[PDB]
Amino acid sequence: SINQKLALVIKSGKYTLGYKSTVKSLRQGKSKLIIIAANTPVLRKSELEYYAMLSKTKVYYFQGGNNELGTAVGKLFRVGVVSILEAGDSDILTTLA
Template sequence: MKSGKCSIGLRQTLRLLRKGGARLIIIANNTPPLRKTEIEYYAMLSKTGVHHYNGTNRDLGTACGKYFRVSTLAIEDPG
């Protein structure tokens, strides 16, 4: 999180996928199925990898070093 560039949230993730700027998408385990399929569809179109995080959105937010829930995370530059 500190050395690379990433975007947090569904809207920013979808925006990056449409532009083709994302390299990897991380989705929390308890993200609603409709949102998961929408992200996976755009990721397939832009040929971006998708990783399903084995934890809740609260766990993903803690892993990112944030004090709020994070359901989706788009990594632009791994650093």
Template sequence: MDIFRENLTAVIKSGKYFVGIKETLKAVSSGEAKLVIIAGDTSVGLKTAVEKKAKKAKVEALVFAGSMKELGHACGKSFKVSCMAITDQMAAGMICSMVDGF
């Protein structure tokens, strides 16, 4: 999990991401999102809606093992983050391959 957070921190430093449900869905709809990450304790209805929209747009959606508070902290935010979209293809690929390796 620490490697995941380190890579996520690198993405955050690049500035190629959006946080929050509205921004994430907007990034998915516009085609900017290359990967969606959803906090593990996000409500089932919200999680399903984001996953459905991502699937329709052919964007991979991963469920973060931690809470919204932990995802927010990993993003360098002082508030809870239910989901986020990564817009950099290389960073998204790196995170996906890392998750597939576990």
């Protein structure tokens, strides 16, 4: 599932948590995938999709809200969007859709 891939990404790869750093990565062109929490506001979701299509970046929609995304990424705070910068030894980039 996505929880195992995300956990392996946290423990091995590179990631950034939060809207501002995610947009920074997208506009730097150095993000591989962005995972958006289900309860993210739709305007923010659409802007992230616009940034991702401009940077030719893949978007995955997490089934949980920000609380569930924070738990999945292994943090004790809510996470609205995750940007995978390096996948590490994880198949999250390729095992999509």
